[PDB]
Amino acid sequence: KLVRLPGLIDVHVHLREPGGTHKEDFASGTAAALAGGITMVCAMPNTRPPIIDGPALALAQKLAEAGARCDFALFLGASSENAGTLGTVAGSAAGLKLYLNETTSELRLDSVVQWMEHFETWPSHLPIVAHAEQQTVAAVLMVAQLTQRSVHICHVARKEEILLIKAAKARGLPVTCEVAPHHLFLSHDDLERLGPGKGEVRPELGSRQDVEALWENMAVIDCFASDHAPHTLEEKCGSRPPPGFPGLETMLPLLLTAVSEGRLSLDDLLQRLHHNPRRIFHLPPQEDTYVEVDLEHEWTIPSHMPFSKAHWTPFEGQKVKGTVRRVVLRGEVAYIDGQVLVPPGYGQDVRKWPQGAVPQLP
Ligand SMILES: O=C1C[C@@H](C(=O)O)NC(=O)N1
Numbered sequence: 001k002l003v004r005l006p007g008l009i010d011v012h013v014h015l016r017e018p019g020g021t022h023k024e025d026f027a028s029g030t031a032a033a034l035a036g037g038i039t040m041v042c043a044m045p046n047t048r049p050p051i052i053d054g055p056a057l058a059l060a061q062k063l064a065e066a067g068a069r070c071d072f073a074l075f076l077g078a079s080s081e082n083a084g085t086l087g088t089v090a091g092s093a094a095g096l097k098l099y100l101n102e103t104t105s106e107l108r109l110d111s112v113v114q115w116m117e118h119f120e121t122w123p124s125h126l127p128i129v130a131h132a133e134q135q136t137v138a139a140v141l142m143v144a145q146l147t148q149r150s151v152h153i154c155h156v157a158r159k160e161e162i163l164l165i166k167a168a169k170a171r172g173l174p175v176t177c178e179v180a181p182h183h184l185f186l187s188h189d190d191l192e193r194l195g196p197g198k199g200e201v202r203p204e205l206g207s208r209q210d211v212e213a214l215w216e217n218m219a220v221i222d223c224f225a226s227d228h229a230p231h232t233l234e235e236k237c238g239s240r241p242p243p244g245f246p247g248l249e250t251m252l253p254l255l256l257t258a259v260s261e262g263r264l265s266l267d268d269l270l271q272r273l274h275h276n277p278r279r280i281f282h283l284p285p286q287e288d289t290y291v292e293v294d295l296e297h298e299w300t301i302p303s304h305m306p307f308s309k310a311h312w313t314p315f316e317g318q319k320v321k322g323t324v325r326r327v328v329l330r331g332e333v334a335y336i337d338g339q340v341l342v343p344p345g346y347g348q349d350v351r352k353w354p355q356g357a358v359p360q361l362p
């Protein structure tokens, strides 16, 4: 007997197109999404070229429309040059992404004043999300308060961070956050097995106490999001390993296992992979869209999942219970038992749907 879930939403994926298509492209990354029970993704802007200007966004939109198999929205990225220039295209994006820790030269902000300028110029009704670790959480929260608006914190990974956000919520501040599965299901205890290259990720893997704190503070976590960050094994195992894990194909099975064990409820999962993504990012419903899962099937994660071009996974060897059997997307069968059945280009930019515009005052 299968359980019918709504179309799940992953608000944090790296699909690598343009410019990194040996790691993933829209077609392979959205195949991975569908096989993970995800019907809508929000793609990050740290591509090559990065999505930091209108021409780059226009290119990425066409590449996504041609390659995506599930629906999507595309983030814009903040740069040291683009504050006050994105007003005409801002509403067509998922939101604005700020990379506030170590990043590329194109996305690097060298001063908190540049963060302020983005918060002051980006349209006030549109989402802002930040890669903000440790004290950077507190710093970006201060900028948000100075500019009188909300912020969403990506991939919270530490006891320190979740407790800070908890304290901010207790003071009524408009902050939301997401957590990635590797910060719930892996820790320092796994670094020996992974090795130093595969184990590289930002935020880094936490201690057992960090992991425990995230679970104990589940009420503070608004969303789950994979931070699907595919790189090839050659890259992960080479001399300058890039940080990141693929995660679209493993996120839902890992979380269903936890539901099975009573660590969180099915509702808790659906708030965090459906309702709260919708409401924080003002993402539209997908008509005639659902995911059927088998909660009884026990399996072991293999050395690579079928679809991501990363062709490796840090969750190899973990025992999970729960699997995606079928996905229907806008009335068409998109996935059954390991076969993706919608072509590249089936997916659409949800920000172009009438119901997908973010409401604003005239
Ligand atoms: O901040 C980031 C970016 C990401 C990537 O590979 O794009 N991978 C990571 O581990 N953290």
Ligand SMILES: [Zn+2]
Pocket (backbone or CB within 6 Å): 131, 154, 155, 202, 203, 227
């Ligand atoms: Zn990040």
Ligand SMILES: [Zn+2]
Pocket (backbone or CB within 6 Å): 011, 012, 129, 153, 154, 155, 178, 225
């Ligand atoms: Zn995020």
Ligand SMILES: [Zn+2]
Pocket (backbone or CB within 6 Å): 012, 014, 044, 227, 229
């Ligand atoms: Zn990311």
Ligand SMILES: [Zn+2]
Pocket (backbone or CB within 6 Å): 270, 275
């Ligand atoms: Zn519901």
